[PDB]
Amino acid sequence: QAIAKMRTMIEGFDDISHGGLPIGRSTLVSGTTGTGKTLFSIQFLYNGIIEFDEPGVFVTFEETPQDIIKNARSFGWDLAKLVDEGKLFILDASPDPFDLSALIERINYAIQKYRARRVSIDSDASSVVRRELFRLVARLKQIGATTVMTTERIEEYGPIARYGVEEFVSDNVVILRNVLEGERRRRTLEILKLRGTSHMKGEYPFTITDHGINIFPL
Amino acid sequence: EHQAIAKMRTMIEGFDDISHGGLPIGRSTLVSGTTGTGKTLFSIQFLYNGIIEFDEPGVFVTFEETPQDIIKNARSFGWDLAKLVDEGKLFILDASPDPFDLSALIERINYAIQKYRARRVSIDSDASSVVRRELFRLVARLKQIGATTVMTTERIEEYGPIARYGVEEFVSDNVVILRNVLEGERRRRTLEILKLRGTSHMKGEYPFTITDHGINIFPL
Amino acid sequence: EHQAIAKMRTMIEGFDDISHGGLPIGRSTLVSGTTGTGKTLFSIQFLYNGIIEFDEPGVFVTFEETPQDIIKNARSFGWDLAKLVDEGKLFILDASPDPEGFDLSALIERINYAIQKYRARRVSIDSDASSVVRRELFRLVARLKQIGATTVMTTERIEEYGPIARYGVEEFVSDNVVILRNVLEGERRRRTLEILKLRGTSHMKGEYPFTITDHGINIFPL
Amino acid sequence: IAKMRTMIEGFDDISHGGLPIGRSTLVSGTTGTGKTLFSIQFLYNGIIEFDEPGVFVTFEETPQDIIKNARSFGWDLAKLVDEGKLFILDASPDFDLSALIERINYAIQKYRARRVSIDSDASSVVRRELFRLVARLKQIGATTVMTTERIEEYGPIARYGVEEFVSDNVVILRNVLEGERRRRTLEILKLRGTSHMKGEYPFTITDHGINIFP
Amino acid sequence: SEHQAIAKMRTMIEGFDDISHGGLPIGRSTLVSGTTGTGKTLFSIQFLYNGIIEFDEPGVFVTFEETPQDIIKNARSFGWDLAKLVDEGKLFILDASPFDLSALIERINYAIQKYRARRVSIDSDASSVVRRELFRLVARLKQIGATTVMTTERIEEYGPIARYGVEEFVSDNVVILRNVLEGERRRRTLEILKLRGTSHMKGEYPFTITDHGINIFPLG
Amino acid sequence: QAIAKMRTMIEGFDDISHGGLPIGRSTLVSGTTGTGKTLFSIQFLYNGIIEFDEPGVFVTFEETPQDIIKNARSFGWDLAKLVDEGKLFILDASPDPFDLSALIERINYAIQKYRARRVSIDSDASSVVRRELFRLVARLKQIGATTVMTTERIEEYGPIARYGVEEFVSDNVVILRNVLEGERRRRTLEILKLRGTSHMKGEYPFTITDHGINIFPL
């Protein structure tokens, strides 16, 4: 009766997570700029829809839906079609040039409307942050969503996220790195923690290509 | 004559060897570590093994993880915590926030210790001043009850401060550090008994793994 | 058309190769660097080449260097910016402070007038709570995108291998990020350029050495 | 200058005869480095070997735990308290610096103590509050060990960056992690007015207390 | 050399005019930053002194802490008689030593016009406030047509260029003097980090301070 | 008329300083705890008296005069006698159970009362720290005193003094270090800066012995 996992179908990931993302829980995906956070959270939804007909909700706070859709064309994915078919909903919480309760109600309404099984959320007292994140995680779990939530960090081998508390209130933590060494960049993915279940340890190299994320062996 | 500090066995593989007999009885042991280092696991094993091996009841006090998730996650190791709660040998005390007062918490814990006649307690998990003073009080109250207690704390660097506020180790009788060090793209888990007041213990870091059977520590 | 984002050529030696075709069109690219790394040079060369090679007018927004000093220094690279200004192909908008809070909303409208007046396709913008910086930069980026400009915006940083920019937020609201470095190794300096991020498209990774010459930036073959 | 023997194995050699009489010695270390043990041993040996009574001042650890913990070294502190040779001054919680000082003075006069151990914002305030404490202990004639906390092995002497500059004598206890192993060392950094061995010397804590190897 | 966009005046400081490809950009300010005792005041004085001796270009020296008497006294280390130059009206030392920047600027202007000065040396809360006033001072000297050396302090050999993290960004030109300690020995170097509108040699170049002032040794 | 120097007679130092301390100015002597700052400043005055019959004034802010005397006995220096003879004056500015201009009054008075040619002063707004040190330096200069003033620092290879401003208002700067080499300590002396005059550069090893500071220029 240990926790079950949901397949990401992201090449390499379901192997190192031994089955995918823990179902009904949130996974924090943290990374410096341009590490593949949005791509991971899109590929999660896109594969849910295409492979399993599991509808998805994508929550954006800054990037517009138009740009998310445009950028996904880089990978040969037609997100506008999936939205039009009612398989995907891009929920725009991005500011026009905060009430967590209101946001949570909108996410819940969208999940019910689209019968969504997968959610991606992308992306000043740390006591405040800790409390609010806790509440968001709790509410998504109550709803039954399996969720990817991305977060920013500014150092490759420093704090997991910005406020030093995000990981401690997350059930699952994944870290994307983009390490510069000898003038070259190397992308890696690490599953740091999955509460109540197993996973491979340490950094695994990956690339972003025309196909999305590809994760490779040691 | 040399009168030794009594210890109670954790029965966590390898730990009773490193600690020269287990955790000092009637005192609190701080168990600190970065995220996913096995803090909750250690604190659950402590109670579980007490009940299963020694019929010593336990109280688990949780501040963030819900009891249902604690129970769910324990299934990963083949442990049936709901059954122990049903038999009244384990009490999970839910101090979660529903999505300040310490005295109330203490009486609640005291009540539970009395009701379930628990010998073992696990507690999971602004200024330097208040945290030092508040933690000092909690240690003192638990000691007056006679509980042997594991209390977990967070830290954010493997080789930095022992806990978050830089004072927690100084008001703790006993300090254990769980590390998860990243080197050359690989992770290595270690456990270190840093301090046990009034008694002996092995020194330095000892590697461990987490598997289907929980924590397994290797000397070395 | 339902195609991945297209690019406009900078014609800066080597850069269009590293970026696989140039800067993403209709978007802003952050160009960050310590002092004297070539930020202003990169911003100007982007506009200059647009005008000379493609007859695409440019607007240069300066916040500290006077237009006269911008024009004077650009002669170092064989470029006659006064001539381009006279012909109405280049407009320098002087937002530099009085030698004798800042309304970014108002400035944006004036930038838009200039873009409209000069029919500009390329824009360069040459350089305290971080939440305020994030929101203001976000709004500027959005407004330029709405206008349809392809924009270079420079920012400052103080360490070669530290934060991308001053407030730790600038790169996260930028679609594109380029880092110019000037690394001191064994008493010598080595200039490098890195495209760190281009949302929605491919680019070469890591650092590429370059020099500044009498013809501007020259990024070496790799 | 006249020194008083600690009789802590190896320490009197390192200090070239012991701790200068009538003066204060800071003993700083990270957690579990042996600060309390050093403090206790200093008083214990003074009583047992030289019939020099002692006062132990504790701010957090209770008297009963101090006594209990000392029992494992085979040291019967309760017996010494009963004989009036040791007084443990409980300043534990459940300012005034001056109120405490007057109580320290009173116990010293009462028990005829020659040895004192004191077991553990603005630098400005701390520096002259500590200077005040040190100055007065001197006037009384006590020879004092004052422990302080630090959070890094190689880094500031003590928490507030001034403690060492008002102390006559400074001792640092370290617990350094090399690879995955811990090694304890003691260093006399400073002894005003006299010579001493320099640098770090390894020690162990065993059933008989601190054992240092020069 | 001839094919460069910015006219320069020669410091006549041995080796500097080579590294700067002709000297300091005329009518602009050059920041000279360095830790303590790196040669900042010496460079500033040598600039004015050589201007007077070589080209009969009068100079103004603005001091904010060192007294004129001590600046004169210390310059005798190099066999320079600054009192004689002050007597002859070729040098003016403006004593601003113990903010009203406007009043200061007017004093500097009056002295420049009074002494017909061509060369100026200035020696030496929020970053934003420092940035804007520095920007203003630079702009005013530029309007006047002065060629200015302005020294600033820094506290690390390989850290920030100056104290407030903004000074280099509002300067047209930036020079860093270092005094690097390595293996118990000090070695002095000079670097021209930036000269807007022109080329210059890059990196660090060795120099010494002797009885003849600064001697820089360029290479390449 | 380059600035002249007065001999310290401290073994090796007059070589490193090419003649001694600049006359009529202050020299800052900075170092971590127990580096020999008080000892250097005492040896400065003791040698003034013994070698040149130049009286000295010692200004103490922490240590009592009695402790200063006692601590110098291990070097064979009889400061009690020097005080009894009126050749040395120890000015006590310790804590009462900050008017700086009061201090100069007291120092000035002692200087002319004792015919003194040498002075030692031993020993968080960097704003005001800079200004007040600047003022003290200037006042001592107008008196004509040649002064050693000690100051604290907390790292062997970091800031010269505590507030990062002290060296910039000092005419002269000397740094004493006490460095770990393996588990042993090595003491070194550095003359970092003497305005308007020459000096040897870098660190020179020294020891503290029964005859005080002993430096080797090698």
Ligand SMILES: Nc1ncnc2c1ncn2[C@@H]1O[C@H](COP(=O)(O)OP(=O)(O)OP(O)(O)=S)[C@@H](O)[C@H]1O
């Ligand atoms: N077709 C492609 N081939 C290769 N790499 C690509 C392609 N399309 C996009 N990328 C890469 O994907 C990166 C963007 O990844 P994202 O998922 O947008 O990163 P991010 O971590 O979300 O960054 P933010 O949100 O801007 S902080 C770009 O910087 C490119 O390096």
Ligand SMILES: Nc1ncnc2c1ncn2[C@@H]1O[C@H](COP(=O)(O)OP(=O)(O)OP(O)(O)=S)[C@@H](O)[C@H]1O
């Ligand atoms: N069956 C299993 N086999 C191997 N590893 C497991 C298994 N079940 C759980 N784990 C590991 O146990 C870790 C969780 O340990 P916890 O005790 O929950 O950590 P924690 O230190 O309490 O972390 P927090 O509370 O989230 S900061 C997971 O990240 C897994 O790596």
Ligand SMILES: Nc1ncnc2c1ncn2[C@@H]1O[C@H](COP(=O)(O)OP(=O)(O)OP(O)(O)=S)[C@@H](O)[C@H]1O
């Ligand atoms: N003809 C040239 N040949 C070689 N290098 C040159 C030439 N002209 C200018 N430079 C260099 O260009 C640098 C200035 O480039 P900029 O683009 O002004 O840098 P920046 O990053 O904008 O610096 P700021 O704004 O002052 S922080 C100078 O410091 C010189 O090193």
Ligand SMILES: Nc1ncnc2c1ncn2[C@@H]1O[C@H](COP(=O)(O)OP(=O)(O)OP(O)(O)=S)[C@@H](O)[C@H]1O
């Ligand atoms: N009988 C014993 N045998 C071996 N080691 C012992 C024994 N008794 C105590 N210790 C050791 O001594 C340490 C405690 O020393 P203390 O002097 O209490 O440390 P401390 O530096 O005062 O730490 P605090 O006050 O908790 S920060 C324990 O952590 C053990 O490692």
Ligand SMILES: Nc1ncnc2c1ncn2[C@@H]1O[C@H](COP(=O)(O)OP(=O)(O)OP(O)(O)=S)[C@@H](O)[C@H]1O
């Ligand atoms: N006879 C001696 N032989 C060798 N070393 C000695 C002798 N007497 C004193 N010392 C050393 O001199 C040091 C004291 O030097 P001080 O000049 O008092 O140091 P300090 O830098 O003033 O330190 P403060 O003021 O306490 S921060 C002692 O720590 C001893 O190491």
Ligand SMILES: Nc1ncnc2c1ncn2[C@@H]1O[C@H](COP(=O)(O)OP(=O)(O)OP(O)(O)=S)[C@@H](O)[C@H]1O
């Ligand atoms: N005749 C000389 N021979 C050799 N070196 C000398 C001579 N005269 C002075 N110096 C050196 O020049 C240094 C003084 O240089 P300055 O120009 O005064 O430094 P600075 O950078 O202005 O320092 P400040 O203002 O005190 S932070 C001294 O520390 C000596 O090392």
Ligand SMILES: [Cl-]
């Ligand atoms: Cl890639």
Ligand SMILES: [Cl-]
């Ligand atoms: Cl493991």
Ligand SMILES: [Cl-]
């Ligand atoms: Cl170059």
Ligand SMILES: [Cl-]
């Ligand atoms: Cl030990």
Ligand SMILES: [Cl-]
């Ligand atoms: Cl030199």
Ligand SMILES: [Cl-]
């Ligand atoms: Cl020595």
Ligand SMILES: [Mg+2]
């Ligand atoms: Mg993104």
Ligand SMILES: [Mg+2]
């Ligand atoms: Mg846990």
Ligand SMILES: [Mg+2]
């Ligand atoms: Mg620029």
Ligand SMILES: [Mg+2]
């Ligand atoms: Mg203790």
